[PDB]
Design a protein around this ligand. Structure first.
Ligand SMILES: OC[C@H]1O[C@H](O)[C@@H](O)[C@@H](O)[C@@H]1O
Ligand SMILES: OC[C@H]1O[C@H](O)[C@@H](O)[C@@H](O)[C@@H]1O
Ligand SMILES: OC[C@H]1O[C@H](O)[C@@H](O)[C@@H](O)[C@@H]1O
Lengths: 154, 154, 154, 154
């Protein structure tokens, strides 16, 4: 029985720690571009989604670490799409929190692999996808990316 | 196995005739407002969708009947949502095509009923929903709304 | 946020009256065969669903009209599937209920059309499908099929 | 547009190695009971799924480990359901294959945590779920569980 007016999607995650502040881009129809920054961890994470055949810039999550290396991943949408997302979660000493954050991220599409970005240290995690698509990102950010999760759809 | 980068939704319809030009707004996360015009049939039809908590103006489908009366259905989103859409499909004498067009439309939410709009003549049709939501509209339009269909999602 | 252990599917309908007793076959992987009976209305209705590549006999809804013509619709699963279900709802005088029942049903697959079964009198209804599949039937039955609805899935 | 009569679900995984023989239980509407055996790895793995309110015995994947202790996880379905499945993948010396297998598994429902089962050695993996349900299991098995994956649905 329907009890709310907002549609929903399957959501997996989050991988990472409880620090930072929660954010959720919601869901769209695909992924066109990913902009992130990295160093000893993943700092910024912002996405340009596809919305019914046209680009749609999602809310930004730059974090507050200005010294990281910036990276732009432009996917050959719609022929190229993610088939796997993996990374590492662990404590970053200079944060003085003792709580896990996203240390590294790797993006694998049906065409190639982007990454690893950041530092592969801590506990690894991976989300291989056999059927379906990531149609949205969610997570937690403070100084850097604390945690990440994904909205999935057929 | 995934073979495309564009996600999908269930699609039902179309109800109505083969006339006019086909249109499809695509899919979103909900419905915020519906703007239509009616006389001896449904003329204009445009929707303001919800996209992850923010309104998104969908493509317009004004048709071409300057004499029709305009109507604005502003839903109390997300608390209020459609639980049924019904209407009538039939020929319009002045079109002299022998083909059906959307003569009438009635929108029923969990809070109230809007309509009927237009003229309830021809063959009735209806889409009562028990679980899930309409997250997008599609159809065909010329001078009036020739046909209509819906994208559905949980 | 998940709150129950039972998965769900989009559900449309019901079309028909409030008489008889409610039933819901639930959802499966597809439809292999439909067995029904018809005369001046639709009497018995039971389905052989597909459950992950193997047939699964669904709950029976025999009704109580022994005089009806019995029909078996064996689909060439999985290449053949329903793209539309339509019919008529209305009062059947002899039932002495004054409530609408399923007077007629027509099943259209991508290969051919089965029916019309029963009597095409009353109010028509139709569910044409552009994307997705009927993966389960639900409704209400007494001596005949009082109402019917469908579970949809990609 | 629909082009096949077989419905589908999102599928994630597999986690583990390439050894053993592939299997896929397919999808259902829930999980009632999980049966497995464990020692220095996960040996047997079977499930009693829910299929529209009734139990459905899933295909068996006993592997072949006489010394492994057997566990029967009977969930308080439908109120109790998995919110996370995690474990470890890695080589098991005695198998003499040099390929990764499922060394350990932990099941976390909204009520309690079951496990860890087996030995937490090798590379960890985890599937936390925020929205949706695991409605089917798939993987590869030989003497033990070589790999595992999941079918997800709302
Ligand atoms: O983002 C990493 C870290 O940044 C700051 O130290 C704070 O916002 C923490 O709460 C957060 O965990
Ligand atoms: O099925 C038609 C009719 O059969 C019986 O008379 C009863 O079960 C009614 O409630 C039902 O409407
Ligand atoms: O299951 C572990 C192992 O068992 C046997 O040795 C074979 O079936 C292998 O292919 C498999 O990897």
């Amino acid at each position: 029985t329907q009890t709310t007016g907002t549609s929903q999607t399957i959501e997996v995650g989050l991988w990472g720690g409880p620090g930072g502040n929660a954010w959720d881009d919601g869901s769209y129809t695909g992924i066109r571009e990913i902009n992130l920054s990295h160093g000893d961890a993943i700092g910024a994470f912002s996405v340009i989604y596809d919305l019914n055949g046209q680009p749609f810039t999602g809310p930004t999550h730059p974090g507050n670490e200005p010294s990281f290396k910036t990276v732009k991943i432009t996917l050959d949408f719609p022929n190229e799409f993610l088939v796997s997302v993996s990374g590492y979660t662990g404590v970053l000493a200079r944060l003085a929190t003792g709580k896990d954050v996203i240390r590294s991220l790797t993006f694998k599409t049906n065409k190639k692999t982007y990454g690893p970005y950041g530092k592969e240290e801590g506990t690894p995690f991976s989300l291989p996808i056999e059927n379906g698509l990531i149609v949205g990102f969610k997570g937690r950010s403070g100084f850097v990316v604390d945690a990440i999760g994904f909205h999935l759809s057929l």
